[PDB]
Amino acid sequence: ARVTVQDAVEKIGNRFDLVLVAARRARQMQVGGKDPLVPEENDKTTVIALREIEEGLINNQILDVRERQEQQEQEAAELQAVTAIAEGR
């Protein structure tokens, strides 16, 4: 397991916002919209997320940028769908 979180608290400061970010990420994995950024040892989404924090590939900034990209990915698809909704006129 992950016995101490201290390195994770090292990367992002607050020690609370860590729990929050890790929660968000662990949810990205748990309800499966996504997959791990680090080898799954049978560590649950909790610890996988934490490991992802330690290795500095996951924090609030990164997740925000990713989500903001995905919004536009869906805009790209529905681009032809919702413009055909010109029936608003």
Instruction: Choose one: 2-10, 65-73, 81-89; the region binding another protein (CB under 8 A).
Output: 2-10
Is residue 36 within 8 Å of residue 29, measured between CB atoms? yes
Task: Provide the total of helices (H) and of strands (E) in the chain, helices listed first.
Answer: 4, 0
Conformational region of residue 4, where left means phi above 0, alpha means psi within -120 to 50, and beta covers everything else: beta
Using alpha carbons, list the distances in angstroms from residue 79 to 19, 29, 69, 71, 72: 36, 28, 15, 12, 10
17 forms part of the interface with another protein (CB under 8 A): yes
Among 11, 36, 37, 46, binds another protein (CB under 8 A): 46
19 forms part of the interface with another protein (CB under 8 A): yes
Minimum distance from residue 5 beta carbon to another protein (Å): 5
Instruction: Choose one: 38-46, 61-69, 76-84; the region binding another protein (CB under 8 A).
Output: 38-46
Binding stretches for another protein (CB under 8 A): 1-6, 8-9, 13-20, 22-23, 26-27, 30-31, 42-47, 49-50
